[PDB]
Design an enzyme around this catalytic site. Structure first.
Site, PDB file in Angstrom:
ATOM      1  N   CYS A 221     -22.605 -41.764  32.403  1.00 53.76           N
ATOM      2  CA  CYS A 221     -23.696 -40.855  32.734  1.00 53.76           C
ATOM      3  C   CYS A 221     -24.918 -41.239  31.862  1.00 53.76           C
ATOM      4  CB  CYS A 221     -23.243 -39.430  32.470  1.00 53.76           C
ATOM      5  SG  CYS A 221     -24.354 -38.279  33.292  1.00 53.76           S
TER       6      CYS A 221
ATOM      7  N   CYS B 110     -27.625 -38.590  30.759  1.00 55.36           N
ATOM      8  CA  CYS B 110     -26.998 -37.908  29.637  1.00 55.36           C
ATOM      9  C   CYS B 110     -27.145 -38.747  28.368  1.00 55.36           C
ATOM     10  CB  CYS B 110     -25.495 -37.691  29.905  1.00 55.36           C
ATOM     11  SG  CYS B 110     -25.077 -36.054  30.582  1.00 55.36           S
TER      12      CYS B 110
ATOM     13  N   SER C 216     -21.571 -39.902  26.775  1.00 50.41           N
ATOM     14  CA  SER C 216     -21.908 -41.268  27.175  1.00 50.41           C
ATOM     15  C   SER C 216     -22.652 -42.084  26.108  1.00 50.41           C
ATOM     16  CB  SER C 216     -22.690 -41.280  28.492  1.00 50.41           C
ATOM     17  OG  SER C 216     -21.858 -40.919  29.581  1.00 50.41           O
TER      18      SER C 216
ATOM     19  N   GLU D 293     -23.784 -42.046  37.261  1.00 52.36           N
ATOM     20  CA  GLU D 293     -25.022 -41.276  37.203  1.00 52.36           C
ATOM     21  C   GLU D 293     -25.995 -42.070  36.328  1.00 52.36           C
ATOM     22  OE1 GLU D 293     -28.389 -39.374  36.040  1.00 52.36           O
ATOM     23  OE2 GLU D 293     -26.903 -39.931  34.533  1.00 52.36           O
TER      24      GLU D 293
ATOM     25  N   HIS E 174     -25.016 -28.866  29.451  1.00 51.48           N
ATOM     26  CA  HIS E 174     -26.117 -28.859  28.465  1.00 51.48           C
ATOM     27  C   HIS E 174     -26.692 -27.459  28.223  1.00 51.48           C
ATOM     28  CE1 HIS E 174     -26.374 -33.211  27.747  1.00 51.48           C
ATOM     29  NE2 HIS E 174     -26.034 -33.329  29.018  1.00 51.48           N
TER      30      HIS E 174
ATOM     31  N   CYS F 257     -23.178 -33.475  35.351  1.00 52.02           N
ATOM     32  CA  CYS F 257     -22.517 -32.570  34.419  1.00 52.02           C
ATOM     33  C   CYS F 257     -23.565 -31.458  34.174  1.00 52.02           C
ATOM     34  CB  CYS F 257     -22.131 -33.306  33.123  1.00 52.02           C
ATOM     35  SG  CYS F 257     -23.508 -33.956  32.118  1.00 52.02           S
TER      36      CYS F 257
ATOM     37  N   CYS G  90     -29.056 -33.668  32.730  1.00 49.66           N
ATOM     38  CA  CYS G  90     -28.159 -34.157  33.782  1.00 49.66           C
ATOM     39  C   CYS G  90     -27.747 -33.134  34.854  1.00 49.66           C
ATOM     40  CB  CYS G  90     -26.891 -34.736  33.147  1.00 49.66           C
ATOM     41  SG  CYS G  90     -25.705 -35.465  34.334  1.00 49.66           S
TER      42      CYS G  90
ATOM     43  N   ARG H  92     -16.896 -35.562  30.362  1.00 51.49           N
ATOM     44  CA  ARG H  92     -16.960 -36.927  29.826  1.00 51.49           C
ATOM     45  C   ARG H  92     -16.726 -37.013  28.307  1.00 51.49           C
ATOM     46  NH1 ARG H  92     -19.555 -36.012  34.069  1.00 51.49           N
ATOM     47  NH2 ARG H  92     -19.439 -37.509  35.799  1.00 51.49           N
TER      48      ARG H  92
END
Ligand code: SF4
Ligand code: SF4
Ligand code: F3S
Ligand SMILES: [Mg+2]
Lengths: 267, 534
Positions: B528, B531, B484, B16, B70, B66, B63, B461
């Protein structure tokens, strides 16, 4: 990557979160497999393509220069500040890549509120000077069909493409360049709770009995009355929608919603 | 013959976001690496001065892969700053939706993002479906026939003969590649399952919308609890349960058996991609204010010393900017964070990424499936231990095998299997609570004028945290520190390489024009970028 039979599609990612890409993966009758195998030829897509680096750039060049022509689907806003420095792919600014690729497409579809109107990164004070595709590339004569939403209903993307392939033309568009067949009505006029709205029966808080009973969410900030989209009708994932889950609409398919619809919990 | 020179992979696909990987290779092996994130949006700058209630809506847009994570992190953050204790049903529903996110995310990662680095799709055309069916039925209680597999072969054949390879266009495996080991039959089994996963994931995603409104970008959370009264009905619970059972069956009978067949064939990948330090925040709470009440518990480990798991101290995190495109070189704790962009171009003044560099006690930490699994195993988690031991016995390898790209890929699988089973337990608990007569899902609260708060989520992640400073009832400062950023961020002011930069050292590169080996390790971390930078 390209040849006769199946229509060529080039998918670009600018300043985005990938939520719009994921929404297409949710395609239902047709499913994504049928789409990629029978309906169209997905020739460039950074999220799922096998090739990477120079091979990906080569695949992109190959697709855009094809004598067969291609349709461009764009996700994300274009950062314009400081010479377009805030967004680069293969060390080229997103402003530059879009400036050279989009004018060459047979048709261009801006998919998602970011690509259509600027989106989340364009909200005040807009550090990267992000713009929607048509705004940023007006000087070049680029006029993309705008499919708004954060992310939009995938039913609207497939519907628009299938229309274009059948009629060789864009469908009727509103003043914001969105298809009237999907964005012609407010979310509010299609809401199951409209009878409560008319009766002035509003939920005063999320923990209240009226909320549990399904009262209207306007007092809690619902933007349904000022937002155009087909959510209550098509629903999402063949099963639900924001207000049926008890939360107000945030006006995600509208031009500068992050600043215009905010505070989200006030009306 | 061994290649020596630079290699740049920009864009890194099947992840991503926008990543540029730069490595220095000497004699066929990587000796140096740089992780460069090339897109900045500045959500933290945009958030200043706004209503705290609005944060979750802006941050979810960090994002779409995922997606819900958030929204959950921001809400846990404001819930915390505000001092509210959400209802039992709110925690159950939030947890069940997160559990569903894990299954959807990992299934898609293995098949749709990772698998093309190990599977030669074109090689499936030369397979014997009868022999392939035998193999498939021996590795799974789910029996597939020669006819089942021939159907896939026929579809693939027609596609290839069109000359329009689409997503497979300049694939690293076209024409064969020395690093691809699978035989035709196994390639066919994997391809059939990749195609099958495309449809199964729609059902795994649907599970989130049952209670969550829609996917991507859920809309059922609010400060104080949740808004979905419909989630209490037997009909909705039954709908969810049915989707869950099917998704779990796919995990158990298709995903895991395939993971093990591929890992057995690529046993040599136990020798590359290892890391030293790990951090994890824990997930699936009984108490929103107690991280140790979670099904998976928080913890930090340095230099693989798993016998000495240290407690997680939130004040020990600092984000560096020395090698990032921000002003100055001062590292800051999130409650005193700064997001002041200043681009200097690739390596300008030794800066090469839009990602900040988080360091725990000044150390770079890997976060994600491998960290959650290894830490829980070490803490004596029964379910994690049972499944990991079975996987190690199946592969005939020692525990040391886990510190690698193959181990990280296997741990993602183990985590999916344990969570899939756990959703069933959480569901029963939810059912039992409703049976007692508890039908509350949101609690009342009040906005303080000045306050501080933080929300913690262990996403697919890794460890995610959102931090807020409220002043005059408005957002004074809001900072996101994501998984990430930890794993793919750049070097710090002490020049310590990040987990991904460090794991790439020693990577063999058979060919240099088709560096699939770099992709194997990079993808094992499940990057990601939206992210990481936000
Ligand atoms: S429109 Fe929304 S879902 Fe789509 S890329 Fe932008 S922020 Fe993401
Ligand atoms: S809940 Fe929103 S869309 Fe529905 S009737 Fe009320 S204001 Fe309109
Ligand atoms: S928030 Fe968006 S998804 Fe529909 S219900 Fe409102 S336009
Ligand atoms: Mg941050």
């Amino acid at each position: 990557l390209m040849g006769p039979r199946r229509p060529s599609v080039v998918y670009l990612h600018n300043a985005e979160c990938t939520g719009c890409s994921e929404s297409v993966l949710r395609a239902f009758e047709p499913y994504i497999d049928t789409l990629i195998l029978d309906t169209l030829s997905l020739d460039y897509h950074e999220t799922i393509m096998a090739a990477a680096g120079d091979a990906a750039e080569a695949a992109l060049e190959q697709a855009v220069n094809s004598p067969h022509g291609f349709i461009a689907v764009v996700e994300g806003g274009i950062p314009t500040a400081a010479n377009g420095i805030y967004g680069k792919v293969a060390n080229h600014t997103m402003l530059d890549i879009c400036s050279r690729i989009l004018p060459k497409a047979q048709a261009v579809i801006a998919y998602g509120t970011c690509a259509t109107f600027g989106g989340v990164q364009a909200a005040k004070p807009n550090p990267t000077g992000a713009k929607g595709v048509n705004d940023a590339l007006k000087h070049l004569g680029v006029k993309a069909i705008n499919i708004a939403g954060c992310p939009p209903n995938p039913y609207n993307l497939v519907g628009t493409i299938v229309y274009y392939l059948k009629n060789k033309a864009a469908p009727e568009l509103d003043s914001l360049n969105r298809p009237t067949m999907f964005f012609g009505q407010t979310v509010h006029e299609q809401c199951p709770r409209l009878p409560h709205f008319d009766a002035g029966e509003f939920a005063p808080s999320f923990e209240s009995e009226e909320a549990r009973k399904g009262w209207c969410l306007y007092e809690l900030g619902c933007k349904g009355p000022v937002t155009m989209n087909n959510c209550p009708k098509i629903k999402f994932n063949q099963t639900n929608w924001p207000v049926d889950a008890g939360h107000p609409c945030i006006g995600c398919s509208e031009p500068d919603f992050w600043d215009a619809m905010t505070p989200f919990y006030q009306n | 013959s061994s290649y020596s020179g630079p290699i740049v992979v920009d864009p890194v696909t099947r992840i991503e976001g926008h990543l540029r990987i730069e490595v220095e290779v000497e004699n066929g092996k990587v000796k140096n690496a740089y992780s460069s994130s090339t897109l900045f949006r500045g959500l933290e700058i945009i958030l200043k001065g706004r209503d705290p209630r609005d944060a979750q809506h802006f941050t979810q847009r960090t994002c779409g892969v995922c997606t819900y994570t958030h929204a959950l992190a921001s809400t846990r953050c404001v819930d915390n700053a505000v001092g509210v204790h959400i209802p039992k049903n709110a925690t159950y529903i939030r947890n069940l939706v997160l559990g569903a996110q894990y299954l959807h995310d990992h299934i898609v990662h293995f098949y749709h993002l990772h698998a093309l680095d190990f599977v030669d799709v074109t090689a499936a055309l030369k397979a014997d479906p009868a022999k392939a069916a035998k193999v498939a039925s021996s590795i799974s209680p789910r029996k597939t026939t020669a006819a089942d597999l021939k159907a896939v072969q026929d579809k693939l054949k027609t596609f290839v003969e069109t000359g329009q390879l689409g997503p497979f266009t300049n694939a690293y495996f076209l024409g064969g590649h020395p690093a691809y080991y699978l035989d035709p039959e196994t390639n066919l089994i994997a391809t059939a399952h990749y195609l099958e996963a495309l449809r199964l994931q729609v059902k795994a995603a649907r599970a989130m919308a049952v209670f969550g409104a829609k996917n991507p970008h859920t809309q059922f959370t609010v400060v104080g609890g949740v808004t979905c009264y419909d989630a209490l009905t037997p009909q909705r619970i039954a709908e969810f349960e049915a989707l869950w059972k099917e998704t779990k069956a796919f995990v158990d009978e298709v995903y895991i058996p395939d993971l093990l067949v591929v890992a057995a064939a690529y046993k040599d990948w136990t020798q590359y991609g290892g890391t030293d330090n790990f951090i994890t925040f824990g997930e699936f709470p009984k108490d929103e204010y107690d991280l140790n009440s979670r099904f998976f518990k928080p913890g930090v480990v340095f230099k693989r010393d798993f016998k000495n798991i240290k407690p997680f101290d939130k004040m020990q995190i600092e984000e560096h900017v020395r090698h990032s495109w921000y002003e100055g070189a001062e590292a800051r704790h999130p409650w005193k964070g700064q997001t002041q962009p200043k681009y200097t171009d690739l390596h300008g003044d030794d800066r090469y990424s839009w990602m900040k560099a988080p360091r725990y006690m000044g150390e770079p930490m890997e976060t994600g499936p491998l960290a959650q699994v290894l830490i829980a195993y070490s803490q004596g988690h029964p379910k994690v231990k049972a499944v990991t031991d079975a996987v190690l016995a199946k592969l005939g390898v020692g525990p040391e095998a886990l510190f690698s790209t193959l181990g990280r890929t296997a741990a993602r699988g183990i985590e999916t299997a344990v969570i899939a089973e756990y959703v069933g337990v959480m569901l029963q608990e939810y059912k039992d609570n409703i049976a007692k007569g508890d039908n509350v899902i949101c609690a009342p609260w009040e906005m303080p004028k000045q306050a501080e708060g933080v929300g913690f989520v262990n996403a697919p992640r890794g460890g995610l945290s959102h931090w807020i400073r409220i002043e005059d009832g408005k957002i004074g400062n809001f900072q996101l520190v994501v998984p990430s950023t930890w794993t793919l961020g750049p070097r710090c002011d002490k020049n310590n390489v990040s987990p991904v930069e460090a794991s790439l050292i020693g990577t063999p590169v058979a060919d240099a024009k088709r560096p699939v080996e770099i992709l194997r390790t990079v993808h094992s971390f499940d990057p990601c970028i939206a992210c990481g930078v936000h």
